[PDB]
């Protein structure tokens with residue numbers, strides 16, 4: 001230590017900038033302070049990062065235990081733990097998967113044991129149409145009308161990858177019903193409390209997303225009409241295709257930036273493909289000292 005400096009946005013404004021961070025030399029106190037910033041400011045942007053794929057993984061390992069993506073076509077060829085979103089061919093070859101995350105979601109929300117921190121290391125940044133949209137679903141919960149808070153009290157939600165599972169090269173010539181069934185076997189829908197208590201901050205988090213949350217059910221386990229989910233999406237800003245909604249944050253980045261964010265509190269999505277500019281990003285996803293919530 002002696003050089004990492006964290007500049008948190010004032011008050012309730014989301015985000016922080018971190019200058020002079022070196023994952024190879026940061027002290028234990030440095031890491032703890034960076035973690036506190038991630039949990040409270042939700043998005044920390046590390047500046048001046050010039051890392052190999054291996055050094056990026058080592059940075060992630062300072063924050064938690066990396067987990068590799070369960071579908072391997074997403075994995076970096078040299079680092080299994082790096083998830084690659086890319087539509088720029090490397091020597092004419094497809095690396096990772098193109099055009100990922102074009103829907104509101106929290107990462108691994110369709111899995112039974114989601115990780116708490118996401119790291120994104122942009123490699124190729126669109127000049128004009130850059131950035132990722134975010135919603136703080138704890139702040140979004142607090143801003144719901146009281147009666148809507150009451151209506152979801154005690155409910156559970158079902159989360160599934162079934163809408164956005166991407167066809168793989170080895171799926172060609174298979175009947176689609178067989179892939180549909182395989183997805184339900186490998187990644188069955190996961191039931192979670194509709195809201196949970198953030199282990200690091202104590203905030204109530206509304207843990208739903210338009211992309212992965214496929215149903216809501218009552219305290220007795222009986223399915224509820226999906227209009228309730230639609231009203232929740234609407235109220236939290238997830239149905240606003242203009243992205244002007246008050247809850248929505250557009251996070252931009254520049255070369256050398258590295259985004260680290262709270263994957264309990266936030267949902268995110270890619271921008272509309274308004275321009276043909278390409279996107280390449282490397283992702284590391286790490287488990288921290290607590291489960292997503294105490295009920296996991």
Ligand SMILES: O=C(O)CCC(=O)C(=O)O
Pocket residue numbers: 085099100101102107164268270
């Ligand atoms: O499209 C997917 O499979 C999800 C990708 C993702 O998590 C992201 O692009 O932020």
Ligand SMILES: [Cl-]
Pocket residue numbers: 106107108109
């Ligand atoms: Cl994910």
Ligand SMILES: [Fe+2]
Pocket residue numbers: 101105106107268
């Ligand atoms: Fe994502």
